[PDB]
């Protein structure tokens, strides 16, 4: 099998500035027939994938100018002129010259845009859940960038690490920031005998970590 | 306008079977050679099967990986592309797409192969404690825990609120999907103007709606 290989993995690029994206096979992709089956996609967030470029340098219809597609053999390269914030997404290449016909591993392309602190703001659990048993606590961390940021839980002062679940939305479509879901789970009885719950927000747009609490009864 | 509409995806228990449909419109879907690409949950694309056209005698070709288990089949009078897929696997799950050539994808179905049952959500909202009262906007959310399989849409307020809300991807935790979803409203509407999520997951043929309240005593 061709082993299709794409670099790098991701990139961060300011709207405006260019990009440039690699590709290469494990053979040659020159068919018999004398044409090479290279093509290169887009998959925007929860869509599915489309088609950018074939024929190695051929732009599909309605697809910008602003896209180029190079090469030959074993090497190819994408490249955006000017990236848009449309243009976000994993690319990936495909070949269609050898069966099977294999893609890349994609190349996740970011926006970069100004740093922001998140707004932090925390939930205790509903009767629903208290009722059933549980008991989760959550945080929600809005609007940050960039995407790495640690949070920490603390029971009346002690830090917990486990029974904690961590979710990220992908870049904002307007924004390009990123929005964090932070879910403490405990039985309803652990919960029940303490009551103080802090979720601890360290982002590197402050030494200070963004702090949010609530007690059981206050 | 050229249209692929997959259909078939589900939860499949290991060693079952299971038949994906797709409906091609708006080409001459007998002169085309027809594809199927699947992309394993936050993974990359893994081309799975193709067949060719009539004129080239419907010969099909396999990834390594389902030869033997998968059958490619079409049916050219109806412009419908198959996948039947036998003995399936844990790692078979997947979002399967339909692709015209290498040109158009469908929207894609997901198929989950797995020894978990469906399991309908728990829906609980999030409303803030005793949080700060001159606060010009108020975050709202809903907890969707412990379903299978994937996936649930939120929705708030029927749709309406669509500025505002992040929808968080699920994470499986132990057999079983945990999702949130918030919403940012001004401090003006609620709690005056109500705020509900309407969750639902198909799977378990689940539509459930919280009202977001504000903390009692
Ligand atoms: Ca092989
Ligand atoms: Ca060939």
């Known amino acids: 099998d061709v082993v299709m290989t794409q670099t790098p993995l991701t990139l961060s690029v300011t709207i405006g500035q260019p990009a440039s994206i690699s590709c290469k096979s494990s053979?040659?992709?020159?068919?018999?027939?004398?044409?090479?089956?290279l093509n290169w996609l887009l998959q925007r967030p929860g869509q599915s994938p489309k088609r950018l470029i074939y024929?190695?340098?051929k732009l599909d219809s309605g697809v910008p100018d602003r896209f180029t597609g190079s090469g030959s053999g074993t090497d190819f390269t994408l490249k955006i002129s000017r990236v848009e914030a449309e243009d976000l997404g994993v690319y990936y290449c495909?070949?269609?010259?050898?069966?099977?016909?294999?893609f890349g591993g994609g190349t996740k392309l970011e926006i970069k845009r100004a740093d922001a602190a998140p707004t932090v703001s925390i939930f205790p659990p509903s009767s629903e859940q208290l009722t059933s048993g549980g008991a989760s606590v959550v945080c929600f961390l809005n609007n940050f960038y960039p995407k790495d940021i640690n949070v920490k839980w603390k029971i009346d002062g002690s830090e917990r690490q486990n029974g904690v679940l961590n979710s990220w939305t992908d870049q904002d479509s307007k924004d390009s920031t990123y929005s964090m879901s932070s879910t403490l789970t405990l039985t309803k009885d652990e919960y029940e005998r303490h009551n103080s719950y802090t979720c601890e927000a360290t982002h590197k747009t402050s030494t200070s970590p963004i702090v949010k609490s609530f007690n059981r009864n206050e | 306008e050229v249209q692929l509409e997959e259909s078939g995806g589900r939860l499949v228990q290991p060693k079952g079977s299971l038949k994906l449909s797709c409906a091609a419109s708006?080409?001459?879907?007998?002169?085309?050679?027809m594809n199927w690409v699947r992309q394993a949950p936050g993974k990359g694309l893994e081309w799975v099967a193709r067949?060719?056209?009539?004129?080239?005698?419907?010969?099909?070709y396999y990834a390594d990986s389902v030869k033997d288990r998968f059958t490619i089949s079409r049916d050219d009078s109806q412009s419908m592309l198959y996948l039947q897929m036998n003995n399936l696997k844990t790692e078979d799950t997947a979002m399967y797409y339909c692709?015209?050539?290498?040109?158009?994808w469908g929207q894609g179905t997901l198929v989950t192969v797995s020894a978990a049952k469906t399991t309908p959500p728990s829906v609980y909202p999030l409303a803030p404690g005793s949080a700060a009262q001159t606060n010009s906007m108020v975050t709202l959310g809903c907890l969707v825990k412990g379903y299978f399989p994937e996936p649930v849409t939120v929705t708030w307020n029927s749709g309406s609120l669509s500025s505002g809300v992040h929808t968080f991807p699920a994470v499986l935790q132990s057999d079983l999907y945990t999702l949130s979803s918030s919403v940012t409203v001004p401090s003006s509407p609620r709690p005056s103007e109500t705020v509900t999520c309407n969750v639902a997951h198909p799977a378990s043929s689940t539509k459930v709606d919280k009202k977001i309240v504000p903390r009692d005593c």
């Open positions: 692709v015209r050539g290498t040109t158009y």
């Open positions: 024929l190695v340098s």
């Open positions: 067949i060719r056209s009539k004129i080239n005698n419907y010969s099909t």
């Open positions: 708006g080409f001459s879907f007998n002169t085309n050679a």
């Open positions: 495909w070949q269609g010259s050898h069966f099977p016909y294999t």
């Open positions: 053979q040659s992709l020159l068919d018999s027939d004398g044409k090479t089956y």
